Structures are given as structure tokens and as C-alpha cells.
Amino acid sequence: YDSIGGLFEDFTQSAAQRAIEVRTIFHMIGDVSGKSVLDLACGFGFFGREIYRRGAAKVVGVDISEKMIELAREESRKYGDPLEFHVRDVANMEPLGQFDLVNAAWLFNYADSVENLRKMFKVVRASLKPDGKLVAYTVDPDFSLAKGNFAKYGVNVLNERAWGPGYRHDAEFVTDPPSQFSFYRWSRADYESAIADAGFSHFEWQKPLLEADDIATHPPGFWDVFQNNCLQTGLVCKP
Amino acid sequence: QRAIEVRTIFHMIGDVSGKSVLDLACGFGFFGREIYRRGAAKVVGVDISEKMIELAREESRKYGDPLEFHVRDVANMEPLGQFDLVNAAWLFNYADSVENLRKMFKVVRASLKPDGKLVAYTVDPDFSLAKGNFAKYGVNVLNERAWGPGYRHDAEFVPSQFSFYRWSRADYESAIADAGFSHFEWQKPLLEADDIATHPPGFWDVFQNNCLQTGLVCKP
Amino acid sequence: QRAIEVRTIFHMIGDVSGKSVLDLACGFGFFGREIYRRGAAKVVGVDISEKMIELAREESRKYGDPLEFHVRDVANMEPLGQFDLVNAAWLFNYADSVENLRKMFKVVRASLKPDGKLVAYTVDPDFSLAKGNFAKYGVNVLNERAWGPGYRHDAEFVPSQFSFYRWSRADYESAIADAGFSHFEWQKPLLEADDIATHPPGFWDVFQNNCLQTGLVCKP
Amino acid sequence: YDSIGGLFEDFTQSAAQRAIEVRTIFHMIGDVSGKSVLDLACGFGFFGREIYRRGAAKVVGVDISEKMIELAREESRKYGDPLEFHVRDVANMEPLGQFDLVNAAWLFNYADSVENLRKMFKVVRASLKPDGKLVAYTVDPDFSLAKGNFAKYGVNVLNERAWGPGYRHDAEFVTDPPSQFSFYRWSRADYESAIADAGFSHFEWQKPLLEADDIATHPPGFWDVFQNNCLQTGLVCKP
Ligand SMILES: Nc1ncnc2c1ncn2[C@@H]1O[C@H](CSCC[C@H](N)C(=O)O)[C@@H](O)[C@H]1O
Numbered sequence: 026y027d028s029i030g031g032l033f034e035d036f037t038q039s040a041a042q043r044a045i046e047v048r049t050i051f052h053m054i055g056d057v058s059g060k061s062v063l064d065l066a067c068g069f070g071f072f073g074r075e076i077y078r079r080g081a082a083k084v085v086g087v088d089i090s091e092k093m094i095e096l097a098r099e100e101s102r103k104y105g106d107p108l109e110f111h112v113r114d115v116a117n118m119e120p121l122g123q124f125d126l127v128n129a130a131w132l133f134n135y136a137d138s139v140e141n142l143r144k145m146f147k148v149v150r151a152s153l154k155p156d157g158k159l160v161a162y163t164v165d166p167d168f169s170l171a172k173g174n175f176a177k178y179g180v181n182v183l184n185e186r187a188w189g190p191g192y193r194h195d196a197e198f199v200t201d202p203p204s205q206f207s208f209y210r211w212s213r214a215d216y217e218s219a220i221a222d223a224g225f226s227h228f229e230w231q232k233p234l235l236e237a238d239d240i241a242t243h244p245p246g247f248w249d250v251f252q253n254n255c256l257q258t259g260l261v262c263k264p
Numbered sequence: 265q266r267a268i269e270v271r272t273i274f275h276m277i278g279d280v281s282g283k284s285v286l287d288l289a290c291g292f293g294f295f296g297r298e299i300y301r302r303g304a305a306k307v308v309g310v311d312i313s314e315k316m317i318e319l320a321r322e323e324s325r326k327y328g329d330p331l332e333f334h335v336r337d338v339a340n341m342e343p344l345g346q347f348d349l350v351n352a353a354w355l356f357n358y359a360d361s362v363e364n365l366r367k368m369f370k371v372v373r374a375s376l377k378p379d380g381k382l383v384a385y386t387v388d389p390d391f392s393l394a395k396g397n398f399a400k401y402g403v404n405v406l407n408e409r410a411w412g413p414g415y416r417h418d419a420e421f422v423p424s425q426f427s428f429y430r431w432s433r434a435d436y437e438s439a440i441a442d443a444g445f446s447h448f449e450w451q452k453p454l455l456e457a458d459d460i461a462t463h464p465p466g467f468w469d470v471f472q473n474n475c476l477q478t479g480l481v482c483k484p
Numbered sequence: 485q486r487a488i489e490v491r492t493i494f495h496m497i498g499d500v501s502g503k504s505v506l507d508l509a510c511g512f513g514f515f516g517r518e519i520y521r522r523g524a525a526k527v528v529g530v531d532i533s534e535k536m537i538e539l540a541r542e543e544s545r546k547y548g549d550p551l552e553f554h555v556r557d558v559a560n561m562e563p564l565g566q567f568d569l570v571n572a573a574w575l576f577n578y579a580d581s582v583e584n585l586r587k588m589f590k591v592v593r594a595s596l597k598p599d600g601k602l603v604a605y606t607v608d609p610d611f612s613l614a615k616g617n618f619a620k621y622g623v624n625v626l627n628e629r630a631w632g633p634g635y636r637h638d639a640e641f642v643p644s645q646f647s648f649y650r651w652s653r654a655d656y657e658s659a660i661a662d663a664g665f666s667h668f669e670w671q672k673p674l675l676e677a678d679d680i681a682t683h684p685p686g687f688w689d690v691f692q693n694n695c696l697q698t699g700l701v702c703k704p
Numbered sequence: 705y706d707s708i709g710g711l712f713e714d715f716t717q718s719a720a721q722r723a724i725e726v727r728t729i730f731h732m733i734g735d736v737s738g739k740s741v742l743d744l745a746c747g748f749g750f751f752g753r754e755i756y757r758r759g760a761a762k763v764v765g766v767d768i769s770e771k772m773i774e775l776a777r778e779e780s781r782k783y784g785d786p787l788e789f790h791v792r793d794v795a796n797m798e799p800l801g802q803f804d805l806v807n808a809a810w811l812f813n814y815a816d817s818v819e820n821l822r823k824m825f826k827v828v829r830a831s832l833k834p835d836g837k838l839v840a841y842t843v844d845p846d847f848s849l850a851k852g853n854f855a856k857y858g859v860n861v862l863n864e865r866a867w868g869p870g871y872r873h874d875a876e877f878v879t880d881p882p883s884q885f886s887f888y889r890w891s892r893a894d895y896e897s898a899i900a901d902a903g904f905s906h907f908e909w910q911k912p913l914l915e916a917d918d919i920a921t922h923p924p925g926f927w928d929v930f931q932n933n934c935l936q937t938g939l940v941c942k943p
């Protein structure tokens with residue numbers, strides 16, 4: 026993402042899927058008043074920064090990209106918030122403390138192997154207080170490119186091929202110009218194995234919160250592919 | 265660009281399942297038809313324009329819903345009985361006198377069951393063209409002219425042009441009380457944290473400091 | 485008791501100086517680590533068992549070598565790029581179907597440079613429990629059961645127990661060809677005159693007439 | 705060795721050093737096809753018998769012990785090979801012909817004086833064709849008992865004391881029961897003098913062929929004493 030940078034924020038302000046994603050993540054999070062929060066794969070800090078604005082006591086953001094962390098620190102310096110950011114690979118992260126809430130919007134689909142998916146979940150568990158929770162947003166294991174591309178919602182999925190036990194997708198954000206990236210679609214069974222083996226005794230998959238107002242304000246059938254072949258899913262896990 | 269309006273109206277309506285609904289100034293029927301989709305038992309739409317009602321009936325055929333429509337002037341409306349809910353999105357700002365505003369509210373009251381309610385969307389009495397135009401949000405207000413105790417505005421959708429009337433809060437509340445309503449509440453449009461978070465900084469500043477629109481709920 | 489096996493594998497490998505090496509079914513890393521010691525530029529080890537990989541990483545710390553390890557199922561392996569040498573000591577006899585045998589060989593081919601090679605150690609297709617058990621040489625074969633087109637054997641090291649699959653020479657050679665390899669050679673274990681001279685007479689008779697093990701080299 | 709006998713063969717089938725010694729001697733020998741071979745200090749005939757199996761035309765063995773020659777003749781009679789054996793003191797040997805190859809595995813460390821070491825080399829020279837060679841295995845002059853005993857490789861060296869210009873070691877093979885013997889460690893200079901004065905214009909000392917496979921198949925450091933304080937060495941001499 027050192028080549029995307031600010032083009033990711035142009036995607037968040039233009040993709041039809043982003044309002045749904047934001048609504049779903051904050052639904053899963055609930056009240057953040059007074060909580061300590063770790064925002065993993067934080068990008069320029071969108072979720073952590075908004076979590077602080079909504080009442081969190083302390084927010085720490087982590088991203089593997091130096092460029093994104095530079096933009097994240099700029100936005101904090103610009104808006105004058107107290108977020109602290111770290112450049113780290115979450116799969117190989119030096120311990121950073123324990124938090125009420127770990128938010129991971131678009132972390133796990135960048136695990137490039139099932140081993141690294143498992144490592145990431147164990148790092149999340151090690152980053153949680155006993156009564157804390159993980160809120161995540163990732164690729165729905167059930168997405169199939171043949172059932173409909175996601176370009177009209179903001180992500181042009183270019184291809185799909187097997188990648189060990191999962192699939193690899195190359196893609197681009199529908200921006201100007203498009204910004205290319207690749208991500209991984211691991212199976213539901215491999216996610217659930219990684220969750221259980223990391224010590225999360227509770228999990229639940231969360232369907233994106235497409236609402237009646239969204240259907241009413243868009244052309245008929247606009248959301249059909251979103252409903253029948255959703256690229257995205259929420260996930261909540263608790264120790 | 266009606267996301268905030270649509271959200272606020274359905275917030276004021278609440279669960280409409282099984283209710284009988286009268287959609288006044290219905291146009292091609294957008295709100296009545298969506299209210300049926302969300303569970304209303306029966307929906308009747310009224311508009312003064314026969315052309316709009318013809319288009320509304322065409323839409324109900326294209327989507328197979330059981331809405332019934334009538335061509336009527338709400339200020340001088342042939343009575344239709346009592347409904348659980350009267351929805352009036354962009355009715356009252358077409359009243360061209362305080363007298364007609366008052367007439368409309370009495371007709372709405374006469375169209376409600378004693379435990380029913382009015383949900384309306386109208387021009388905020390406190391809007392002032394000098395405090396900032398609304399074009400960024402889809403309505404360009406072209407002018408502002410004194411009109412007895414109120415104001416008259418020419419405007420355009422950003423595409424078609426129209427005119428409306430901005431009556432004072434005092435005159436609305438008097439019309440509400442004199443029509444027979446026991447309770448009312450003004451409802452600012454339901455701008456939410458997610459709307460501010462997903463738009464450029466300060467995008468909504470004029471929307472909040474000089475909103476053109478307001479919701480209104482009245483109960484017998 | 486691995487002297488003959490170790491000798492034969494490094495005979496098939498040849499000089500590994502400066503090569504990049506992928507050690508499949510690596511266990512605690514015995515062969516990958518020794519291949520590095522003999523001059524390989526870079527060694528990556530893969531095993532399906534996270535426990536084995538944890539132990540492999542522990543060994544590399546105890547001896548200060550730069551081996552990298554991954555937990556992967558070779559039959560369904562996340563791709564790792566192309567290597568000069570793939571070493572697979574006791575991989576293919578864990579394929580539990582001909583289909584999985586074929587899958588493994590295609591993954592190995594996909595892991596090789598066009599001028600690279602596979603060196604493997606596996607069960608000799610011609611082994612037959614009736615012709616003599618192997619316990620004298622360190623592996624007690626407990627039984628022999630038909631398993632579709634092949635055989636399944638329970639065995640023990642002489643101490644721990646395991647099971648493996650004995651697939652036919654025809655099925656190996658078909659999997660080799662269908663995976664894309666242009667050349668293969670079966671390599672009997674490199675029993676040498678010095679081994680016969682230093683052991684009691686006829687000690688190696690069963691080893692030679694009914695060997696459990698074979699080497700195999702494949703080239704793109 | 706009239707009291708050791710078959711206990712020496714139990715040593716050859718059990719000592720860790722024996723595989724190395726055998727490999728090194730046959731490396732020095734090379735191809736024996738069609739050659740005539742004299743195996744001096746032959747014991748029960750191990751090297752001569754294996755040299756015949758690998759292609760030699762004719763093999764003659766010599767040992768000073770009547771018992772060892774009896775066992776050697778038994779093994780030949782048992783396996784049906786054509787080796788011919790003689791009971792002779794190599795230092796005082798009646799001429800026995802001239803050969804392509806003289807093999808002397810553990811002869812020279814039984815010379816009990818430098819005079820007898822010299823006599824043995826002259827007997828070897830007199831037993832060689834002009835284009836022949838001597839292959840020998842003997843005690844490394846540089847062995848020092850204080851630098852590490854050899855018991856873990858098969859030879860428990862019990863002591864070390866001066867013996868004229870050299871050293872005498874009493875020892876035992878690690879067998880059941882142990883078999884005691886004594887041998888002599890003559891200096892490198894005295895070996896090289898005996899070689900030159902016998903008429904060998906070429907010699908080379910050969911390090912035992914400890915191989916990577918040997919290190920890989922034994923516990924770490926097992927061969928450290930073998931490498932730093934080797935008891936054994938090869939030697940090749942040519943007219
Ligand atoms: N292993 C890893 N550890 C930490 N961050 C990673 C990572 N792999 C990818 N990322 C980061 O994950 C981000 C995906 S974009 C998601 C940005 C942000 N969470 C938002 O939703 O607004 C990129 O910024 C990328 O650099």
C-alpha cells in the first residue's frame with residue numbers, strides 16, 4: 026500500500042460499499058466509551074480515528090506500510106487527535122499491550138498463507154483483555170467471481186485462482202487512476218480453525234448491514250450482486 | 265441525494281407493519297410505495313396533479329403493488345376516512361397562504377384515527393438564504409421574497425424548477441394546534457456520525473447551520 | 485541407522501553449493517539443515533505439522549543456521565516460487581491416494597526452475613511384506629493391506645509408530661510424467677562394498693532382495 | 705595376538721573407527737583389478753580377502769601369529785577363496801616375491817624399535833615391483849594421549865610413556881571382554897627416514913577419510929577427538 030496511499034481515501038469517499046462497511050463495523054463495535062482500542066491494518070487511521078471521536082479512551086493503530094503510517098500520523102497531526110501509530114507486521118508483531126477492543130478492518134485478507142492467518146489470530150488474542158473482543162471485516166469465504174464482479178460497489182476484482190487451500194484475487198479500487206492490489210480468500214473452515222486454535226471460544230459471522238433505506242435510494246436491483254455474492258463479511262470473536 | 269430525507273422520514277414513521285397509510289402530495293408515489301414495501305397493510309396516495317397520479321399508477325403496475333391513488337387538492341379534499349398514519353413529504357411548503365396551511369392541517373387531522381400520527385417533511389422555518397445556499401445538497405435556492413407573514417422561494421433541483429413557501433414556526437404551530445393536534449415535535453434531519461465520517465471535512469457544515477429541510481411529527 | 489539413506493540422498497543431490505533448496509516434509513529439518521551445511525545458498529523447509537515446524541525452528545536456533553520454515557500441506561501448498569533443488573525425504577509415501585500422489589508431484593514441478601531437479605526418498609513399489617520384514621534395518625513393517633490400487637502399511641521405528649502408502653511404480657511414473665517432468669530415475673539405496681565387508685555375512689541379504697526404500701530423481 | 709584371535713573381528717564389526725579405516729585404505733589402494741597383492745600383518749585376512757573380492761589376481765597374507773594365520777586359513781577354507789597365508793616375522797621375513805601392491809594395515813606400529821621399523825620398510829621395498837606401491841595404516845605420530853582417549857572409537861589407550869626415541873602405548877580393544885595389546889608410536893621423522901633409506905622416493909601421509917555423512921549420522925561433536933587427536937593415519941609409498 027506504499028503505492029496506493031491517499032488513493033485509498035478517495036476510494037472510501039466514493040465506493041458504494043463503504044457506507045455499508047462503516048455502518049456494519051460500528052454496529053459490531055457498539056459503545057466505545059472509555060475503552061482502549063487497537064486498530065490493526067489501520068491504513069491512514071480511519072476507523073481508529075473515528076472510534077476515538079465516538080468516545081474511546083485510547084487508540085493505537087498498526088500498519089505494515091510506512092507510507093500509510095506517515096499519512097495516519099499526518100491526519101492526527103492535522104486534526105489534533107492523540108492516536109499513536111506503529112509500523113509493524115501484525116503476523117509477526119512485537120507485543121503491544123492488551124486492549125478492550127481490537128478492530129481489524131481488512132487485515133485478514135492480507136494473510137498470504139493459512140499459517141499467517143493463524144499467526145494473526147494468535148496475535149489478536151494476545152492483544153486482548155479477558156473480557157475484550159475482536160471486531161473484524163474481511164473477505165466472505167463464499168464470494169465467487171463468476172457470480173458477479175464487485176466493481177460497481179468500488180472493488181474491481183480482476184481474477185481468481187487457487188492459492189494452496191484458498192484463493193488469490195488480484196484487484197483494483199475504482200479510483201483515478203485505479204490502484205492495484207492483491208488479497209486472499211481463505212475458507213470458512215480455515216478461519217474457524219484459526220479462531221478456535223487462537224483461544225477464541227466465541228465467534229459469529231456478521232452479514233453486512235444493507236438497509237431498506239439503501240435499497241430505496243438506489244436503482245432497482247443495484248444491490249442484487251451485493252446480496253447474492255457479497256465480497257465482504259463482518260466477524261466478531263471473544264475469548 | 266435523498267438518503268438523509270428518506271432515513272429521517274422512516275425514523276419518524278417507525279414500524280408501519282399492518283397500518284393503513286395515506287400518502288399526501290404523493291407525486292409518483294415514492295414514499296407510499298416504500299411504506300407498503302416495509303409492511304403497511306394498505307396505502308392510498310393523493311396528489312393534486314392528474315399527470316403525477318397517472319405516473320404513480322404506472323409505477324404500481326411496473327412493480328405490482330396494491331397502492332390506490334386519487335387526484336385531490338389536500339386543501340380542499342374530498343374526505344377519505346381515518347388512517348393510522350398520514351405521510352406528507354413536501355406537502356405543506358406548497359401552501360401559498362397561512363389560511364391554506366391551516367386548511368391542510370385540519371384535513372390531515374380529519375384523516376387520522378384518534379391514536380394515529382402525521383409524519384411530515386417540509387421547509388425549516390429558520391432557513392435563510394443569506395446563511396448559505398443548499399446547492400451542495402441538491403437544491404439550489406434562487407431567491408427569497410417576502411410573502412405576507414412568510415417567504416416565497418424559487419428553487420431548482422440539481423434538473424427542474426419549482427417554488428415553495430416558508431411559513432414561520434409560530435404559524436405552523438398555530439395551524440397544528442388549531443387543527444386539533446395535542447402534540448407535535450420538530451425533527452432535525454437525522455445526520456449521523458457515519459455521514460460525517462464518510463464525507464470530506466466540513467461537507468455538512470451548511471446542512472447543519474442553515475438546513476433547508478425539517479421533519480415534523482404531530483399526534484391527535 | 486540412516487547411514488545408507490543419508491549417503492544415497494546426498495549422492496543424488498550432488499554438489500549443492502550456492503543452490504536454493506526446498507526441503508519438503510522436512511520434519512525437524514534434518515536434510516535441509518545438512519544441505520545448508522554442505523554449501524546451499526538458501527534452504528526453506530515445509531511440513532504439514534506445526535509441531536514439527538516449531539521443533540525445526542528450535543533446532544535452527546540451537547545451531548545458528550538461516551533456514552526458514554513454513555507449515556504447509558504439500559498436496560495443497562501455497563506457492564513458494566522456483567528452487568534449484570527440491571528434496572523430499574519421506575514425502576510421497578504419505579500421499580493417501582493416487583490423486584494426492586499426483587497433486588504432490590505437480591506442486592514439486594511448480595516449485596522447480598526449468599534446470600532444477602527433485603531428489604526424493606520413498607517406499608520402493610516392489611517391497612512385499614511376505615519377502616522379508618525390515619526390522620533388522622530399523623523399520624518393523626507390521627502389516628500390509630490393499631488400498632485401492634496400492635497398499636497401506638502400519639509400521640514402527642525401532643521407537644514410534646506410523647503408517648504409509650505403497651503406490652505402484654506405474655502410478656508413480658504416471659504422476660511424474662503428468663506433472664511435467666521430462667526425465668526420472670529410480671536409485672536403489674547405495675549399499676557399498678565397505679558396508680558388506682564390515683557386517684556379518686548375509687546381513688544385507690533382505691535389504692537387497694526386498695528393500696523397503698528407494699531413491700528417485702526427477703528433472704523437468 | 706595369539707590371545708586375541710576372534711576378538712579382533714568383534715572389534716572390526718563394532719568400533720566406530722573401523723568404517724573410516726576401511727574406507728581410507730581402499731581409497732589409497734584404488735583399482736586392484738588384475739594386481740598381485742601382499743597383505744602384511746594380515747590378521748585373519750580381512751583386507752587381503754576383500755582385496756581379492758574386489759578383483760585382485762593373487763593375494764598372499766603374512767602374519768607373525770600362528771593363531772591368526774589359522775583363523776585366516778579357516779575363513780578362506782570357509783568362504784572358498786584362493787588366499788595363501790604364511791607365518792612370518794615381517795621384520796625378518798624370508799623373501800616371498802615381488803608384488804604390485806603391498807598392503808600393511810597395522811604393521812608398523814608393532815615395530816618395537818626404530819631399527820625394526822627400518823627393517824620392515826626395507827622388506828616392503830624388496831617385496832615390490834618397480835611400479836608398485838605400499839599402502840599402510842599406522843599410528844599417527846602426532847597422537848597425544850592427553851588430548852583425548854580413543855575408547856569411544858574402539859581403542860582404549862591405557863597409557864603413554866617414552867620408549868627410546870618414540871612412545872609405547874598399552875591398550876585394549878573395546879570388546880567383550882576387552883583384549884589387551886601394546887603398540888609403538890614412532891616419530892614422523894623416524895618414519896620418513898625409514899622410508900627414504902629403504903629406497904622409496906615418493907611418500908605421502910593420508911588423513912583418515914572422515915566424511916560429511918559420518919558427521920551427519922552421529923551426535924554433535926562425536927568426531928571431535930577423532931579430528932583433533934587422531935590415533936590413525938594412512939601412508940602411501942612408491943619406489
Ligand atoms: N500483515 C499486515 N500487518 C499490518 N497491516 C497490513 C498487513 N498487510 C496489509 N496491511 C495493511 O492493511 C491495509 C488494508 S486497507 C484497510 C485500511 C483501514 N483499515 C480502513 O479500512 O480504512 C493497508 O493499509 C495495508 O498496508
Ligand SMILES: Nc1ncnc2c1ncn2[C@@H]1O[C@H](CSCC[C@H](N)C(=O)O)[C@@H](O)[C@H]1O
Binds near residue numbers: 310337338352353
Ligand atoms: N394542495 C395540494 N394537494 C395535493 N398535492 C399537492 C398540492 N400541492 C402540491 N402538491 C403535490 O406535491 C408534490 C410535491 S413533490 C413531493 C412528491 C413526493 N411526496 C416525494 O417526496 O417524492 C407534487 O407532486 C405536487 O403536485
Ligand SMILES: Nc1ncnc2c1ncn2[C@@H]1O[C@H](CSCC[C@H](N)C(=O)O)[C@@H](O)[C@H]1O
Binds near residue numbers: 508509510558572
Ligand atoms: N502432505 C504433507 N505435506 C507436508 N508434510 C507432510 C505431509 N504429509 C506428511 N508430512 C510430514 O512428512 C514427515 C515424514 S518424516 C520425514 C522427515 C524428514 N524429511 C526426515 O527425513 O528426517 C513428517 O514430519 C510429516 O509431518
Ligand SMILES: Nc1ncnc2c1ncn2[C@@H]1O[C@H](CSCC[C@H](N)C(=O)O)[C@@H](O)[C@H]1O
Binds near residue numbers: 747814
Ligand atoms: N612383526 C610382525 N610381522 C607380521 N605380523 C605382525 C608383526 N607384529 C604384529 N603382527 C600382526 O599384526 C596384526 C595387527 S591387527 C591388524 C590385522 C589386519 N591387518 C586388519 O587390519 O584387519 C596382528 O594380527 C599381529 O599378529
